[PDB]
Amino acid sequence: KRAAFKQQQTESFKKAVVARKAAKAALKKTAYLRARKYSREYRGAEKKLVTLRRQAASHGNYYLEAKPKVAVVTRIRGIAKVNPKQRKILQLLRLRQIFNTVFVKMNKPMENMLRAVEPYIAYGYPSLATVRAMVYKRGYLKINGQRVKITDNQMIKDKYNNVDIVCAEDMVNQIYTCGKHFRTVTHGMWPFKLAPPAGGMRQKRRHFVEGGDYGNRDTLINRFLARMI
Amino acid sequence: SHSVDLQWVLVRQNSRFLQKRGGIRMSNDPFNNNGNWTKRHCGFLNEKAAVVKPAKGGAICVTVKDGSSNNKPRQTYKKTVHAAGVRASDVSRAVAAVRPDLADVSFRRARRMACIASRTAKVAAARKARSEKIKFSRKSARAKR
Amino acid sequence: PTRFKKCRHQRGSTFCGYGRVGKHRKHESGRGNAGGMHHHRINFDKYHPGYFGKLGMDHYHRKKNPMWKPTINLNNLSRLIAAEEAAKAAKGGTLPVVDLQSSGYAKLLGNGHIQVPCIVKARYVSKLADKKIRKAGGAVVLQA
Amino acid sequence: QTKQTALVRVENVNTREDATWYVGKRVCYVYHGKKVKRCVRWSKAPARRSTTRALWGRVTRPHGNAGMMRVKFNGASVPASAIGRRIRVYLYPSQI
Amino acid sequence: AKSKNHTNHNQSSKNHRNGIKGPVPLHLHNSKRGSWLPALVNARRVRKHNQKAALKKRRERIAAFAAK
Amino acid sequence: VKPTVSKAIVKKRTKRFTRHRYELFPQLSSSWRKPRGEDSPVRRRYKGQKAMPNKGYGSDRATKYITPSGFRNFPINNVEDLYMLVMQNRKYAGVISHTVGARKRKAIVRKAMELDVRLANGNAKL
Amino acid sequence: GVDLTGISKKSRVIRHHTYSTNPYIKLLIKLYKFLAKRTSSGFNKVVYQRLIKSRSNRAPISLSRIAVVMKRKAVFTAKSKAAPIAVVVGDVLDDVRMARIPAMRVCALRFSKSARQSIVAAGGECLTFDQLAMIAPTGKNTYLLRGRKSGRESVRHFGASGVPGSHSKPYATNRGKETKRGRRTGRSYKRKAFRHV
Amino acid sequence: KNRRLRLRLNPYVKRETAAAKGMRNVANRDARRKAKLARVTKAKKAATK
RNA sequence: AAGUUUGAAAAGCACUUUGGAAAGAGAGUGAAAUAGAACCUGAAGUCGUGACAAAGACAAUGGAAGUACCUCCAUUUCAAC
RNA sequence: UGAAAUGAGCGGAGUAUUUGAGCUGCGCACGGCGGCCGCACGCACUGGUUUCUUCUCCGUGAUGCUCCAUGUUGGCGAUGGAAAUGGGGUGCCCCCACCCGUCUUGAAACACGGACCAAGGAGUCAAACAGACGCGCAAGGGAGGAGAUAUGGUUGCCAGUACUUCUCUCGUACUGAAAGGGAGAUGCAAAAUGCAUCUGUGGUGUGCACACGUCAAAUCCGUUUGAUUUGCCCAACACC
RNA sequence: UGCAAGGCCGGAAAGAAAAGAAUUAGAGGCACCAAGUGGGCCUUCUUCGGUAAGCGGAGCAGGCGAUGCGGAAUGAACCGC
RNA sequence: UAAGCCCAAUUAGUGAUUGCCCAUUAUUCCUUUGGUAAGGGCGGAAACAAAGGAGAAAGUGUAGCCCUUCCGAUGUAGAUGUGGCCUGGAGGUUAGGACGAAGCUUAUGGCGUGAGCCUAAGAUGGACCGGCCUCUAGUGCAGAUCUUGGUUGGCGUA
Ligand SMILES: [K+]
Ligand SMILES: [K+]
Ligand SMILES: [Mg+2]
Ligand SMILES: [Mg+2]
Ligand SMILES: [Mg+2]
Ligand SMILES: [Mg+2]
Ligand SMILES: [Mg+2]
Ligand SMILES: [Mg+2]
Ligand SMILES: [Mg+2]
Ligand SMILES: [Mg+2]
Ligand SMILES: [Mg+2]
Ligand SMILES: [Mg+2]
Ligand SMILES: [Mg+2]
Ligand SMILES: [Mg+2]
Ligand SMILES: [Mg+2]
Ligand SMILES: [Mg+2]
Ligand SMILES: [Mg+2]
Ligand SMILES: [Mg+2]
Ligand SMILES: [Mg+2]
Ligand SMILES: [Mg+2]
Ligand SMILES: [Mg+2]
Ligand SMILES: [Mg+2]
Ligand SMILES: [Mg+2]
Ligand SMILES: [Mg+2]
Ligand SMILES: [Mg+2]
Ligand SMILES: [Mg+2]
Ligand SMILES: [Mg+2]
Ligand SMILES: [Mg+2]
Ligand SMILES: [Mg+2]
Ligand SMILES: [Mg+2]
Ligand SMILES: [Mg+2]
Ligand SMILES: [Mg+2]
Ligand SMILES: [Mg+2]
Ligand SMILES: [Mg+2]
Ligand SMILES: [Mg+2]
Ligand SMILES: [Mg+2]
Ligand SMILES: [Mg+2]
Ligand code: NA
Ligand code: NA
């Protein structure tokens, strides 16, 4: 019949199965609640901005928008004929391959880093849909040094070990709002590897202002990425 | 004295029972139930072993080494013969009484022996039927002593 | 064995690891120790300083036998004392007698701490060795 | 050239929308050999025995803007001796 | 014949291939050899006192641990 | 005996890697030799030239070494060698060595038919 | 097409098998590979890694060094606690300079005859690594030791002896040769004994 | 685009698509447009007074 | 330079026929005669012949993918399959 | 082709859950005028209304360590000088495609060697040294040359194997040109060879494991896996 | 009791706040033994001699050499990769 | 009424923001190979004759223990590795051969990424010889105005 150590393993595995199902249910409920809260926060923030703009326009004033805090950066040139400073900057940006895409904080250090590699990278200000699409379709985590596709919230919770980041919507919120754990989330992910933009580019050798591709194109980066994603 | 691990390290690369033909490492060890050249199947090497053998009459013989007489080569292996029609599970239990890690292969080998006996009988019958119509100019008969 | 050399690995390489440009020529730098002061100066200077020049007096007919003077330290005297001799040895009692010249030593040196006290017969001794061996309850006996 | 894909120009198909309508349709190239070889219904329909052979393919996607189509034949590619020759584009499989 | 005289063309690339190594830190290889002699002698005397003090403290710690 | 069914056998390349320009000189064997010429267009990988073997052409390990019958070849020299393949008769087939004579081959073939052991070159019958 | 420049500089030379042909070393490697994989303790991992190493990197250790470090551990060790097992993954060699040693339990790959005799005579025990695995599978209450390699003549010969600050021995069969030009100030210069770094 | 994976990552995606369907509703959209225009125009006209 | 290394044994091709002869065609010895004499095996290269594949002039060769035709080859199937 | 279907998708059960959009309460926030007047409908009450919109809950471990084995409808296959598939040949079509080896910044070169084939043809052996790795012993290691005797035997195996050196050599100690001198620790101390003891890292900084706890995370609740405090610190590095 | 230097004992430690307030496909150090190479050429930009040169000579950096592939009809180096 | 030049666009003041073609590039799928590789299983769970099967090795490296999962793959000179291939001998160990051994021939197939290995057929041969572990070397040819031998177009030509 069944050996003693086999029976002990059977009991332990039964307990493990029960615990795993309970943990899956709890994580699902927590993720649902967090996603609801983030959705309501986003909608409220947009409505608040709309009302502020309307109040400004009503009395002849202007509304200055908040300077964007996050930029999404993609490499649009190959790896040939790169000067050492640009090569080092692109290595620090984890943009080692063409159409590699990352999120960075739009502050003075990073802004001056991006100014020196502008001919190589097209960048701009991501929308919520862009962040969600990249995380859901192109999102990969660094797990034991391996590039592992995000398929469940349990792996996210195991990767980050942070109460603030237990699901994909926590990652989307941290990236989009530049939260306390922005660097943790973005560094925990593998650099995004995108397809070429379906429909073609304009000109990789010219700035977007000149009719090319390589500049800061503000929120127009979203159409470019939507074709790339 | 000298453990099975040490002997296996000594003989894994070079041995008379290892048959490296092509790139396949088989084993013509008579106490190997499988023909694979592994430490588990080397019946000539392990302290205890059990190998399923054919017997005359379609019977199955189980050869067992116990490790009690491993220093007496003519007393090392004791043969037990199972009458024809024996369940392969009974042979599997006879083997597993000495080595539980050879139960599945011993069951498969006992069933294989039964199939081999039945097919050998059929092929012999067919050959005898074919031979009844040949002239056979020469026939050799061994003398009796 | 010939089957382990780089020659076997280089069959079909056409150059055997000497290059297409420099090639393998007979003596591209001279023979032996040539040029130690010209075109091999850096190698000699950084790897064999002191190689050139003269130093010291000459000794025309040098004989090693008169100069024979091997030495042993105090903390190595157990190598000459046997096991039961070492076990039965203490200050004020019967001590093993060590004959240095029969054991192949001429001078007794004083490095370390003597473990088992003993009477040492030596041709030579340092002052520190003599002082220490007397302080430990042993002695040194001069011999020729 | 890459011979695993072939380009077929069909009469009265001069727009990418028409070629899209033809995506997935079966495609046949009919020729003849020198001998009479095996065929479908060789035994059932001995009247089909002939030197005539056929290579079958399907329309994979439109090509360009002017009604050209990309065709891939089953396994082997279509021979270059068919360049400039007739191609049969049937109306099946039917989506309408 | 005439050849090229001098260039530094590939030399920075070669220097950075194994990188320009950072300096040995200040706490390593801080030898005082060649420094101002009176200060070195005074510091040597202080260090000898400190070695005596360290031996004394170790003996006291062993004694305290044994007594406990 | 029937061989064990495996995944469909896929060969990355059927043509052999033959030595460069061996058809022009009768003394050159077709056996592959790595071109080490400085200007060699095969070594430099020009588009219209023949290819060089590399690790990417290696066969799928699941179906590697499997003959078209589905079995794997094991050289066999006498009757006693048949019993090594008895338990694995659906995986290995016996290949009688070329230098085994017709007499011992008759013995081997008879025993292999009795044992239901496939022979790759055991002629005729079944 | 990924810009991986110097990625091969990151790779280090890691060996997972032994060059040793000794079958008993193979058995120990098997045992401690299993132990390091299946037990959480870092002692087993270090022991397996050292068993993989080469002969030059498993340097011998004297018996006197073991006695000194074990005494240094014995003070500040509670008298109730038993003394640790000294574990060396090389050879243990006797030391004629230390006649009196305590009763120590020493585990080593090999003992010299004199070292084994000394340990047994002092009241201690020479342990074998499989005995250690049976009596301490995790490595609890052990003293893992290494031999000294800084005093080997190969190390004393490493580096150029002609650069300033260098005190390496030259490769010279004759000692009286190579003593004049770069060695004495009177022979036009002397290699400086010290150099700030 | 995969329902299994999208729902696994975001359990709240059912409510979001329900709200999207509500917004796409023609009667709902037209009523909302009329109400929004009236409401915003009234608010602006009151604000400028 | 050159192994006289035919064959177990000369049993070293009697005899007939054409040919001036050399030889040929038969016959015979031999287990073998493309074992016939400085003769065991008899390679490559080159050449002859019969059959077949065709093929302008793209020097030829070569790669990749098909197809026509052939295949003394390798497998698998032939029936509730 | 269900040999594990994880499914908003396959089952079971409920007519509901709660998303959003409308309308709207209180306070705050925001705007204007400088406390009021406005609030486009922002935040908290996870506010109210359900007028429109919407699927809502549960659910199966592996007692499968691994690999391989499962539909439908026709055609072709009924032992055939068969069918089929895969290999080989030869020709053709479309496309692709400069002559090899070499020196050279640069070769298809109007740079050199290149009619064919067979056989042959080029990092070897010895000695000194050193480094890596494998062995054996280790404060010791090892010969060598010779001896004896199994063998004072045997055609030959056997020119091998077996055995022994108060020796020799390398090392355990360096240094000076030489004369010739020659290295432990601690304590008390301050003697131009000080004295006492001998279970001992000369000291400091950084430093595996181990021991002691203390934290955080994940836990099948047994633990593991990352710190990190203290002690000892091995090996190593640095300063004395 | 001040200063200087070695220590010892305690304290406090956003482990480095907020102000755009870094980032990293960030294992840091330490050796040992050796090979080829030591004729270079081209290019953006800067530059010297020369009327100039597909000339001679330098600086920063990319290439070719050592490298094909896709483009500029063709071209070591141009564009893309 | 460009198929030229300078500007613009993407099916056109219609109702929104991807015309189309081509890479050894990008994304993705399959397979190979190597990691500074990352993990799981390995105490045979129980049962099971013939007239669901087989395997399961504590392992650098093989036909790799087995499975899962990531990442990288070009390269002269040059280095290194390879239970990587091949040749003549030596210790071993297993075989084979007059019912045909080595040599030789091939539209003669199979296996291997390859060096190569194996089978088949000789209407070839007529006596030796294969596999595996280890030891050993006069151990691999396409070219050196290479050596020797033979052949050869020029040529039935001068
Ligand atoms: K020939
Ligand atoms: K063809
Ligand atoms: Mg373009
Ligand atoms: Mg450019
Ligand atoms: Mg069982
Ligand atoms: Mg060559
Ligand atoms: Mg070399
Ligand atoms: Mg040179
Ligand atoms: Mg003088
Ligand atoms: Mg120069
Ligand atoms: Mg092949
Ligand atoms: Mg070149
Ligand atoms: Mg043959
Ligand atoms: Mg030393
Ligand atoms: Mg001759
Ligand atoms: Mg006859
Ligand atoms: Mg013949
Ligand atoms: Mg002949
Ligand atoms: Mg449902
Ligand atoms: Mg040359
Ligand atoms: Mg030139
Ligand atoms: Mg050339
Ligand atoms: Mg020219
Ligand atoms: Mg020349
Ligand atoms: Mg001797
Ligand atoms: Mg010394
Ligand atoms: Mg800050
Ligand atoms: Mg040169
Ligand atoms: Mg020039
Ligand atoms: Mg060059
Ligand atoms: Mg062009
Ligand atoms: Mg090379
Ligand atoms: Mg030879
Ligand atoms: Mg041919
Ligand atoms: Mg040779
Ligand atoms: Mg040759
Ligand atoms: Mg001629
Ligand atoms: Na012919
Ligand atoms: Na000696």
From Swiss-Prot, chain G:
Pfam families associated with the record: Ribosomal_L18 (PF17135)
Protein's cellular compartments: Cytoplasm
Cellular component, GO annotation: cytoplasm; cytosolic large ribosomal subunit; nucleolus
Annotated Basic residues bias: 178-197
GO biological process, one term: translation
Molecular-function GO terms, alphabetical: RNA binding; structural constituent of ribosome
Principal location class: cytoplasm
UniProt region (Disordered), positions on chain: 156-197
Keywords: Cytoplasm, Ribonucleoprotein, Ribosomal protein
SUPFAM superfamilies: Ribosomal proteins L15p and L18e
Family note: Belongs to the eukaryotic ribosomal protein eL18 family.
Protein name: Large ribosomal subunit protein eL18
Organism: Leishmania major
